[PDB]
Structure 1
Amino acid sequence: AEDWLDCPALGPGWKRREVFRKSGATCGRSDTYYQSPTGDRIRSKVELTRYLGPACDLTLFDFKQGIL
């Protein structure tokens, strides 16, 4: 199952999804995606740190797993 799920560590409206690669050299590797409350797609802790503003300190946030 790789549907969108709430991500409360990030806060109301945020969605997360983990997808397993199906073919190629990297079959079985996974990738984690986020979707912002406003619909913006994020695929890296760098895109996400830039998005949320200085307000948020993600030092202790595991982007891959979605936890603190």
Structure 2
Amino acid sequence: MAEDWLDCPALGPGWKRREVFRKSGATCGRSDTYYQSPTGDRIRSKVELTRYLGPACDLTLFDFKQGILCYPAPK
């Protein structure tokens, strides 16, 4: 178990992101990144992330393939 859990500053402390290069079947070869909340919540995408954070807390600067906030805020 434990494929590769890496930190995820795209949200805050506690968050963890992982990479999944498929395993087989038909979709084999695709890479899916899964990340768990910072203290209790399984999110598999940005929407799921926007859920535990609230609908008003959008995440357009969050990378679904990396799990990081490339840019914090403009002004």
- Report if TM-score (shorter chain) is over 0.5: yes
Partners of 1:25 and 1:61 lie apart in 2 by 28
Alpha-carbon offset, residue 51 of structure 1: 1.2
Percentage of pairs with the same residue: 100
Partners of 1:27 and 1:41 lie apart in 2 by 23
Bigger Cα Rg: 2
TM-score, L = length of structure 2: 0.75
Alpha-carbon offset, residue 39 of structure 1: 2.8
Partners of 1:39 and 1:65 lie apart in 2 by 20
Alpha-carbon offset, residue 53 of structure 1: 2.0
Partners of 1:42 and 1:2 lie apart in 2 by 17
Aligned length: 68
Could you tell me whether the CA contact under 8 Å between 2:4 and 2:18 is conserved in 1? yes
> Structure 1 residues 38 and 10 mapped into 2: Cα distance closer, same or farther (>3 Å)?
same
In the TM superposition, structure 1's runs of 4+ consecutive aligned residues that sit over 4 Å from their partners are none
TM-score, L = length of structure 1: 0.81
Cα-to-partner distance string for 1:15-62 (whole Å, 9 max, x where unaligned)? 000111111111110111111122311112111111112563311211
Gap regions ≥5 residues in structure 1: none
Aligned alpha-carbon RMSD (Å): 1.9
